[PDB]
């Protein structure tokens, strides 16, 4: 029941992700070395990862079918609201349930719950973040469902500051319809059962996470010495 267009969309998104996301994590060396001793020692290294991740998210977003039609202001707005949520979403592939930590192929790159704390984030943001990763991981979504989820997240009509709600909504719906249709046609029971609703629920979780992150960022970022550690891209994307 998948139109040729729907199959095309999946192929584009999958391609977009592969270019956007590197399984090797080879680029990580370029970030300021991780410091695990010490308040805020993790933040320089994490900021760099986040900054790097923002660039990758932006590059994925642009490839999304119909995203380019949006006005510059609508594209910028979607990304700023979206970008933290996509990083948590994308970061799921690195996240391992065994150790309960994001794993980047090396001991230094592997990130503890404490490492996140070390950046300057309280458990209230972090515990919910870990639960989210567990709950998303549990879904064991196909790569196609993972890519589509990220795309649907980015193209949200209800994002704050969106000049044209109707256009964003039209793009998203095509992605939603693709995703629903994919689960039915390409996803077998019993794992498929409720999967669309469960995925949509994750977007509600991300909104909560986003809001929390923003409050915690503002406290950390309010301090000029801590803000100084953040990258320019981070300040622009997460600040304003």
């Amino acid at each position: 029941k998948l139109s040729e267009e729907q199959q095309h969309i999946i192929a584009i998104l999958l391609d977009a992700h592969h270019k956007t996301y590197d399984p090797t994590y080879a680029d990580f060396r370029d970030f300021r070395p991780p410091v695990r001793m010490s308040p805020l020692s993790m933040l320089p290294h994490l900021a760099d990862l986040v900054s790097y991740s923002i660039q990758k998210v932006i590059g994925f977003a642009k490839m999304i079918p119909g995203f380019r039609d949006l006005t510059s202001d609508d594209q910028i707005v979607l990304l700023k609201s979206s970008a933290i949520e996509v990083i948590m979403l994308r970061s799921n592939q690195s996240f391992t349930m065994d150790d309960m930590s994001w794993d980047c192929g090396s001991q230094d790159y592997k990130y503890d719950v404490t490492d996140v704390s070390k950046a300057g984030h309280t458990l209230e943001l972090i515990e919910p973040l870990i639960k989210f990763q567990v709950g998303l991981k549990k879904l064991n979504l196909h790569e196609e469902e993972h890519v589509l989820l990220m795309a649907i997240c980015i193209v949200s009509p209800d994002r704050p500051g969106v000049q044209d709600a109707k256009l964003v909504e039209a793009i998203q719906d095509r992605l939603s319809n693709t995703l629903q249709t994919y689960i039915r046609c390409r996803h077998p029971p019993p794992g498929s059962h409720q999967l669309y609703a469960k995925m949509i629920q994750k977007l509600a979780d991300l909104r909560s996470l986003n809001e929390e992150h923003s409050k915690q960022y503002r406290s950390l970022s309010f301090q000029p010495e801590n803000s100084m550690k953040l990258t320019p891209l981070v300040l622009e994307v997460f600040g304003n």
Partner: peptide, 11 residues
């Protein structure tokens, strides 16, 4: 709206 780096990247 004062997003030079984001805007350029999207470009």
């Amino acid at each position: 709206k004062n997003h030079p780096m984001l805007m350029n990247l999207l470009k």
